Structures are given as C-alpha cells and as structure tokens.
Amino acid sequence: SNQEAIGLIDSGVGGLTVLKEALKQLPNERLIYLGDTARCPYGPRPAEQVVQFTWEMADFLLKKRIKMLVIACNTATAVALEEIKAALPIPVVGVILPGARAAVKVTKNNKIGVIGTLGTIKSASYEIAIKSKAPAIEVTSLACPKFVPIVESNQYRSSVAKKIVAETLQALQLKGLDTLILGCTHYPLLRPVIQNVMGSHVTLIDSGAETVGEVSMLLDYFDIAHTPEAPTQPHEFYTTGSAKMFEEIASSWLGIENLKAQQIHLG
Amino acid sequence: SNQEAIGLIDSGVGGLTVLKEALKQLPNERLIYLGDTARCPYGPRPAEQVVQFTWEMADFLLKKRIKMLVIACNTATAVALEEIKAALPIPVVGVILPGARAAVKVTKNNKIGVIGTLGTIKSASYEIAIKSKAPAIEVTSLACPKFVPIVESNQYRSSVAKKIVAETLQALQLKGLDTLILGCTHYPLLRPVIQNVMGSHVTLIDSGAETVGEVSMLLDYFDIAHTPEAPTQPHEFYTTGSAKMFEEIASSWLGIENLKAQQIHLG
Ligand SMILES: N[C@H](CCC(=O)O)C(=O)O
Ligand SMILES: N[C@H](CCC(=O)O)C(=O)O
Ligand SMILES: [Ca+2]
Ligand SMILES: [Ca+2]
C-alpha cells in the first residue's frame, strides 16, 4: 500500500541520479534500488535483450511488493516502458519524457542536443519525444559508449574522464546548442566535466532528476504517497555485481557514509 | 484518441482559470469547457448534491468523446474526484493536490492560508492534503461565500469587490501567513484585489493554474497528447446559463474577442 517502497532499476549506478533527487524531493518515501551491474552496459545490447533484463529486474522488485516502479534507465525506458506499464497494476515511470519536456522549456535558440547510449540513440526516443512536442526544435543526438565504463570504474572525476568527454563531445562543439540532455542516467555523474566541455552557456538537462517531479505528482494522482514521516525501514540497495564497488560509488555520490548494498543474482 | 479534446467542468466561469493556463502551456490541445452557471454556486450545496451535478457535467462531456476530464472546481474535486476517477476509463484531474504541492514548496514560515467555498473548507480537503505532505505547516482555512457571486455578476474589478474582499479577508490579517491558496477556481479573477488586501509579501497560489503542469505530464504518462499542431476543431464553451453573460466574462478574461458559448441543459 502507501507505505510500500518505490522501486528503481538501472544497469548500474546510473539510476542513482534519479534516487539522489528523490532523496531530496521525497524524503519520506522508502526506496529500493537495483542496479544490474553484472550485465552493465545495457547500451550496446539488443532491444529484446534489454527488455528481458529489465523484466528480470522488475520481477525482482515486484517480489519486494513495491507500489511504483521507476525505470531509472534511458536505455531500458526506450524499449521496455510501454510493455511493462501495460502489464503492471502499479504505476511505471520512465525517464525520457520528463527530460524532453524540460529541455523544450529551457531552449532559447531551439538547438537541443541529446547524449546517450547506443541503444537510446538507436531507438530515437528523445528525437521522437521532442518532435511530438515542438517540431521546430533542431535535435542533435550522439551516442557516447565510453561514458558508462568510466562512471562504473569510479573514475568520473579523473583526468581519464575529462579526456574521454572532451574527445567524444567534440562532435557537438560546432552546432551552437544552448541545451544538452544527459540522456543516460550515468551521465550526471560526469556533469561537471560535461559542463566545462560544453561551456557555461549550455543548459544541461538531467532527465533522471526531472523525473522525480513526475513521480511526486503520480503519488498524488494515484493516491499512494507514504505518510509524511521517515519510513520505519531503511532504503535498500541491490546489485548483481560487487557490493563493495557499488557502495564506494553510491556512498560518495549520494553523500551517505557507510551505505551498504547487497549482491544478488538475476537469471 | 490523442486528437480528442480535454474536457473541463466547473460551476461557472471559475474553471476558466484552469483553461486560460492550459491555452498557455498546451497550445495544441483541444479544449471543451462546461460551466453549470444555472446551478452556481456549488459552494453552499450539500456534498451529495455537488457529486450528482458534477457527474452530470462529466457525463455531458464524456458524450463529446473527451480523452481526459479536468474537474476545474475545488468544490467538486473535494467531494467527487475519487469516485469519478475510479469509474472512468480516462484520466480525471482534480485541482486541489496541485495547489497543495505548490503551496508547500513556496512557504518559508510554514504558515499557509487557504480560501475557498463553504463546501471546500467544510471538506477540509486542503488541510488534509497539506498535512499529508508537511504536518509542520500550520494551515489557516477560510470560506468566502461572497466571492463567487461578484465574479459571476462580472464585478470582479469593481469597487464593490474591493470592499467585500477586504471585509472577508480581515479574518486572515495578522496571522503571519506568507502563502495563501486561492482554493476556489473563481478566485484568481479577484487576484489583484486579494493580493492588495494580503500583502505583496504573500505568495498567492492559483490551484487551477498549477494543475495544468500535472495535466501536461499526464498526457505524456498516458501517452494521449495531441499532435504538435493547432487542432482542426476550435475550443468549445458550454453553460447552463446565459450564453451572452458567459461570453462577456470569458472573452474578457481569456482575451478572446467574440468568443462564443452554447447554452445547454443538464438534468
Ligand atoms: N544508465 C542507463 C544504461 C547505461 C548502460 O548500461 O549502458 C541509461 O540511462 O542509458
Ligand atoms: N469554482 C468552484 C465552485 C464555486 C461555486 O460554485 O461556489 C470552486 O473552485 O470551488
Ligand atoms: Ca553504449
Ligand atoms: Ca460558498
């Protein structure tokens, strides 16, 4: 019921960008996170495989009785959102449309860029979403396969990351974009680097963070909000990979000392 | 269909405060409005009667194939939202929760006031909503029975309106409120007067307007947004009262010269 947790799934630590913002806007909601680290990256995988893996993660949390499911993953939202939403009795939230709505609102020169995994770009989800809202906007999409690995290796602040981002985003430097969507939930971890590379005049859109606003309204629409007090059970973090590696990134990113995660199996 | 209209219902011209904002944020959505002017005000009517009338209005628009129903009336939202939402196959949007979420975010001293009809205040919908989010917030509620009549009689900018608002709102003076929810959709038509009576330091919350943001995200969640182009059919306005009286107010408030309404019957 209303006291159950909101579940969030992703290929790894990416979904944490949705969870971090949820800790801020919805401090009284209990969260259960699952990052399929063992199979990350989902980016280059075939659509049907991402759908399969997404269902496996969804099934894992459904067992935990979640009252809402957030696909805190652009790659998975692009190919699995519609199917999962139609199948489940609980609200199912994707992260693409919230980011698309936000970018459309901030652009002044109608030049919006979108960076994401090979899978998200291949699906054209962002291009399609932006066109369904404002066709006049020129959308530039770019897949950045090298970003997730450096986030997952916990080097998103290293010199290695600064060079990777600079080289990759060079393809966008001559477009004159005034807006760039971080179409991969792993990317906000590289936000300071991406911002420096793009320039102070480019507004970055954190799609995962933008989704929390929707989650908030959906809790009211479906009338399933937690009571306005701290949950009696703590947030739970699961990963198919090393709990130790996951905790080092999560603890630092979320600013939660000694955060602990559990290694589980999916298959 | 994504091309059908979004319907809005209210006791009279108050719902126009939701519609006006919809024309701004959702230019490509076709709208059908119905104000039950003949039975306005709903404010002092028993809850069961308001439910009855609200269903008749909803039924009237459902017959026009609306893809979404907006109860642009706090009085009706307070007592009929739950029932209507559970019964219809289309999204049903109330104006109370959006206003409560906005108010909670803007208050600094946690002292929020809310003005509305006798019915809205009697239901305590706002008090309950705000307490369900931030119980620390002190809510001051006040029914303003004289407000709707002066809006309906097209006197909201007259000198008599200044007297009535000041006399009525004296109950909220020196209460330390830094936020006031306009909990009746007719009230935004009296905004400048209300703002002057309360201080320029008090943030006014237009619940009806706040609801449009939710409508926008719901169109995406349910994937039923109109194509990004002006609809091929114009907006429609209906009233159970004088069309001439309705158009006089509507055309002025919306800034739509020669707006035309149709008088119809409900029962
Ligand atoms: N973090 C997910 C998937 C990243 C990946 O596994 O490649 C996304 O937003 O696209
Ligand atoms: N305008 C409606 C009802 C006003 C009335 O009929 O009294 C509301 O928001 O309360
Ligand atoms: Ca990739
Ligand atoms: Ca009243």
Side-chain angles (χ1 to χ4, degrees):
Chain A
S1 187
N2 297 200
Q3 299 307 76
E4 294 299 355
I6 294 172
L8 288 83
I9 61 181
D10 178 57
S11 61
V13 300
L16 258 36
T17 58
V18 172
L19 185 147
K20 183 173 186 182
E21 180 67 16
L23 295 183
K24 185 175 181 184
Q25 294 183 50
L26 301 166
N28 292 145
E29 291 291 336
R30 186 159 79 84
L31 316 174
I32 295 177
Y33 185 96
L34 169 60
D36 195 0
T37 313
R39 292 156 166 171
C40 185
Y42 272 22
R45 294 173 184 284
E48 63 265 21
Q49 175 166 267
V50 167
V51 168
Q52 183 199 316
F53 292 2
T54 300
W55 260 123
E56 302 196 328
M57 289 195 283
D59 289 329
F60 183 76
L61 295 192
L62 281 165
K63 295 282 193 173
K64 306 289 193 173
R65 314 182 193 188
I66 57 171
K67 66 183 180 180
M68 171 182 280
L69 176 66
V70 183
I71 301 173
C73 175
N74 298 83
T75 303
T77 290
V79 306
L81 180 56
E82 184 182 303
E83 172 178 348
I84 293 181
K85 176 139 64 177
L88 306 185
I90 57 175
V92 180
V93 183
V95 292
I96 298 178
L97 288 175
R101 294 194 295 271
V104 169
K105 298 173 185 175
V106 310
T107 192
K108 295 297 190 300
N109 66 23
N110 290 320
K111 284 185 171 60
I112 300 183
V114 177
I115 48 180
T117 61
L118 292 164
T120 303
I121 304 307
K122 168 181 177 176
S123 72
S125 311
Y126 274 102
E127 179 184 71
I128 293 175
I130 297 172
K131 302 284 176 166
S132 74
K133 298 173 182 303
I137 294 174
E138 169 73 295
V139 184
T140 298
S141 294
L142 173 66
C144 313
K146 296 209 64 191
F147 289 10
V148 167
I150 190 142
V151 174
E152 289 291 314
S153 63
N154 195 183
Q155 308 171 203
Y156 54 86
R157 281 168 294 184
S158 71
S159 57
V160 173
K162 295 183 182 176
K163 299 186 183 300
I164 293 179
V165 176
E167 301 194 318
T168 298
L169 302 189
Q170 190 59 57
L172 298 173
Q173 303 286 28
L174 302 174
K175 316 298 284 185
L177 312 178
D178 76 348
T179 303
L180 178 61
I181 302 178
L182 306 183
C184 173
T185 55
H186 278 77
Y187 298 5
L189 283 94
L190 300 168
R191 187 161 181 172
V193 173
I194 295 176
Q195 183 70 264
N196 177 62
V197 170
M198 296 303 289
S200 67
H201 65 79
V202 179
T203 298
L204 283 42
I205 296 294
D206 184 326
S207 291
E210 294 297 332
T211 302
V212 179
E214 178 173 309
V215 173
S216 172
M217 91 79 113
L218 290 175
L219 293 174
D220 284 356
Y221 184 87
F222 286 102
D223 186 36
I224 51 172
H226 189 285
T227 50
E229 66 173 67
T232 54
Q233 292 165 271
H235 300 312
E236 298 167 30
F237 300 84
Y238 299 95
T239 179
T240 52
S242 167
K244 183 187 178 184
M245 171 52 120
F246 183 90
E247 306 173 331
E248 306 193 329
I249 297 173
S251 63
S252 176
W253 186 246
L254 300 178
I256 299 180
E257 283 185 51
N258 297 150
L259 163 35
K260 298 300 175 180
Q262 185 64 52
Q263 184 175 196
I264 53 84
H265 183 65
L266 292 180
Chain B
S1 174
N2 293 46
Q3 306 305 72
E4 296 305 326
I6 293 174
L8 292 86
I9 65 182
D10 177 52
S11 62
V13 303
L16 254 34
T17 59
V18 176
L19 186 146
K20 185 172 184 182
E21 181 67 16
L23 297 175
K24 174 167 169 47
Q25 294 185 46
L26 303 166
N28 302 139
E29 290 292 336
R30 179 185 152 210
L31 316 178
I32 294 176
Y33 187 87
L34 165 59
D36 193 7
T37 314
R39 296 148 152 180
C40 182
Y42 273 27
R45 295 172 180 283
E48 54 271 13
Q49 185 170 246
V50 168
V51 167
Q52 186 201 314
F53 295 176
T54 298
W55 256 125
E56 305 186 327
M57 283 196 289
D59 184 58
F60 185 78
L61 297 194
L62 286 164
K63 292 184 180 180
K64 297 184 181 306
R65 306 199 59 158
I66 54 164
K67 65 184 182 180
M68 173 185 278
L69 174 66
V70 179
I71 300 170
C73 174
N74 302 78
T75 304
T77 287
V79 301
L81 176 56
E82 186 186 310
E83 172 180 352
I84 295 180
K85 174 149 62 185
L88 302 182
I90 62 170
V92 180
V93 182
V95 293
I96 296 190
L97 289 171
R101 294 194 295 277
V104 168
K105 295 178 187 296
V106 310
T107 188
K108 317 297 175 182
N109 63 26
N110 295 324
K111 297 183 183 179
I112 304 178
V114 52
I115 50 178
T117 58
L118 293 158
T120 296
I121 302 310
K122 184 177 186 177
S123 78
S125 295
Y126 272 103
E127 183 186 65
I128 298 173
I130 295 172
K131 289 294 181 177
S132 75
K133 301 165 177 299
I137 294 171
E138 282 181 271
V139 182
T140 299
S141 297
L142 172 69
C144 308
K146 299 169 185 177
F147 288 12
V148 166
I150 61 185
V151 174
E152 289 289 312
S153 60
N154 192 194
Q155 305 171 183
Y156 55 91
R157 294 177 175 177
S158 69
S159 200
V160 306
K162 188 182 184 182
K163 180 186 178 178
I164 298 171
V165 176
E167 298 302 283
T168 293
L169 303 191
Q170 190 64 47
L172 305 182
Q173 300 300 307
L174 298 169
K175 284 285 201 177
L177 313 171
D178 72 349
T179 303
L180 177 60
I181 296 177
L182 303 184
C184 171
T185 53
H186 282 73
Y187 297 3
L189 276 99
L190 293 160
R191 190 158 179 168
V193 179
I194 295 174
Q195 185 77 74
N196 286 322
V197 175
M198 302 303 286
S200 283
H201 64 303
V202 180
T203 296
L204 265 32
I205 298 294
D206 184 326
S207 295
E210 293 295 337
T211 304
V212 178
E214 173 172 315
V215 171
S216 163
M217 103 81 233
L218 285 172
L219 291 173
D220 282 357
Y221 185 87
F222 285 103
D223 183 37
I224 55 167
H226 189 284
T227 49
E229 50 191 47
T232 51
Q233 281 196 262
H235 301 310
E236 290 168 39
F237 302 83
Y238 298 94
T239 181
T240 52
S242 168
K244 178 183 172 185
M245 227 58 94
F246 186 88
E247 309 171 329
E248 179 178 291
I249 295 172
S251 66
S252 181
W253 190 250
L254 306 179
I256 299 178
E257 296 180 297
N258 286 164
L259 174 156
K260 293 301 177 181
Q262 184 66 41
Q263 182 179 184
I264 50 74
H265 167 67
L266 291 178

Coordinates of all heavy atoms in Angstrom, one line a residue, chain A residues 10-11 14-15 40-44 72-75 117 120 148 183-186, ligand 1:
Chain A
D10 N 18.1 0.0 -12.9 CA 19.0 0.5 -13.8 C 20.1 -0.5 -14.0 O 20.1 -1.6 -13.3 CB 19.7 1.8 -13.3 CG 20.7 2.4 -14.2 OD1 20.4 2.6 -15.4 OD2 21.9 2.5 -13.8
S11 N 21.0 -0.3 -15.0 CA 22.1 -1.2 -15.3 C 23.2 -1.2 -14.3 O 24.0 -2.1 -14.3 CB 22.6 -0.9 -16.7 OG 23.1 0.4 -16.8
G14 N 23.8 4.2 -12.5 CA 23.1 5.3 -13.2 C 21.9 5.8 -12.5 O 21.6 7.0 -12.3
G15 N 21.0 4.8 -12.2 CA 19.7 5.1 -11.5 C 19.9 6.0 -10.3 O 18.9 6.6 -9.8
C40 N 26.0 -4.7 -16.9 CA 26.2 -3.3 -17.5 C 27.5 -3.5 -18.4 O 28.4 -4.2 -18.1 CB 26.5 -2.4 -16.3 SG 26.7 -0.6 -16.7
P41 N 27.5 -2.7 -19.5 CA 26.5 -1.8 -20.0 C 25.3 -2.5 -20.8 O 25.5 -3.4 -21.5 CB 27.3 -0.9 -20.9 CG 28.3 -1.8 -21.5 CD 28.7 -2.6 -20.3
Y42 N 24.2 -1.8 -20.7 CA 23.0 -2.3 -21.5 C 23.0 -1.6 -22.8 O 22.4 -2.0 -23.8 CB 21.7 -1.8 -20.7 CG 21.2 -2.7 -19.7 CD1 22.0 -3.7 -19.0 CD2 19.8 -2.6 -19.3 CE1 21.4 -4.5 -18.0 CE2 19.3 -3.4 -18.3 CZ 20.1 -4.4 -17.7 OH 19.6 -5.2 -16.7
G43 N 23.8 -0.5 -22.9 CA 23.9 0.4 -24.1 C 24.0 -0.3 -25.4 O 23.3 0.0 -26.3
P44 N 25.0 -1.2 -25.6 CA 25.1 -1.9 -26.9 C 24.3 -3.2 -27.1 O 24.4 -3.8 -28.2 CB 26.6 -2.2 -26.9 CG 26.9 -2.6 -25.5 CD 26.1 -1.6 -24.7
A72 N 14.8 3.9 -14.0 CA 15.8 4.9 -13.9 C 16.9 4.7 -14.9 O 18.1 4.8 -14.6 CB 16.3 5.0 -12.5
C73 N 16.5 4.3 -16.1 CA 17.4 4.0 -17.2 C 16.8 4.3 -18.5 O 15.8 3.8 -18.9 CB 17.7 2.5 -17.1 SG 18.8 1.8 -18.4
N74 N 17.5 5.3 -19.2 CA 17.0 5.7 -20.5 C 17.0 4.5 -21.5 O 16.0 4.3 -22.2 CB 17.9 6.8 -21.1 CG 17.9 8.0 -20.2 OD1 18.6 8.1 -19.2 ND2 17.0 9.0 -20.6
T75 N 18.1 3.7 -21.5 CA 18.2 2.6 -22.4 C 17.0 1.6 -22.3 O 16.5 1.1 -23.3 CB 19.5 1.8 -22.1 OG1 20.7 2.7 -22.3 CG2 19.7 0.7 -23.1
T117 N 23.3 6.3 -24.6 CA 23.9 5.1 -25.0 C 23.6 4.8 -26.5 O 22.7 5.5 -27.1 CB 23.4 3.9 -24.2 OG1 22.0 3.8 -24.4 CG2 23.7 4.1 -22.7
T120 N 19.8 4.0 -26.7 CA 18.8 5.1 -26.6 C 18.8 5.9 -27.9 O 17.7 6.3 -28.3 CB 19.1 6.0 -25.4 OG1 19.2 5.2 -24.2 CG2 18.1 7.1 -25.2
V148 N 29.7 5.4 -19.8 CA 29.3 4.4 -18.7 C 30.5 3.7 -18.1 O 30.6 3.6 -16.8 CB 28.3 3.5 -19.3 CG1 28.0 2.3 -18.3 CG2 26.9 4.2 -19.5
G183 N 21.0 12.2 -21.7 CA 20.1 11.1 -21.9 C 20.5 9.7 -21.4 O 20.0 8.7 -22.0
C184 N 21.4 9.7 -20.4 CA 21.8 8.4 -19.9 C 21.9 8.7 -18.4 O 22.7 9.6 -18.0 CB 23.2 8.0 -20.4 SG 23.8 6.6 -19.6
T185 N 21.2 8.0 -17.5 CA 21.3 8.3 -16.1 C 22.7 8.2 -15.5 O 22.9 8.7 -14.4 CB 20.3 7.5 -15.3 OG1 20.5 6.1 -15.6 CG2 18.9 7.8 -15.7
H186 N 23.7 7.7 -16.2 CA 25.0 7.6 -15.7 C 25.7 8.9 -15.9 O 26.6 9.3 -15.1 CB 25.9 6.6 -16.4 CG 25.7 5.1 -15.9 ND1 24.6 4.4 -16.2 CD2 26.5 4.4 -15.2 CE1 24.8 3.2 -15.7 NE2 25.9 3.1 -15.0
Ligands
LIG1 N1 22.2 4.1 -17.3 C1 21.3 3.6 -18.3 C2 22.1 2.4 -19.2 C3 23.6 2.7 -19.3 C4 24.3 1.4 -19.9 O1 24.2 0.4 -19.3 O2 24.9 1.4 -20.9 C5 20.9 4.7 -19.3 O3 20.4 5.7 -18.8 O4 21.0 4.6 -20.5

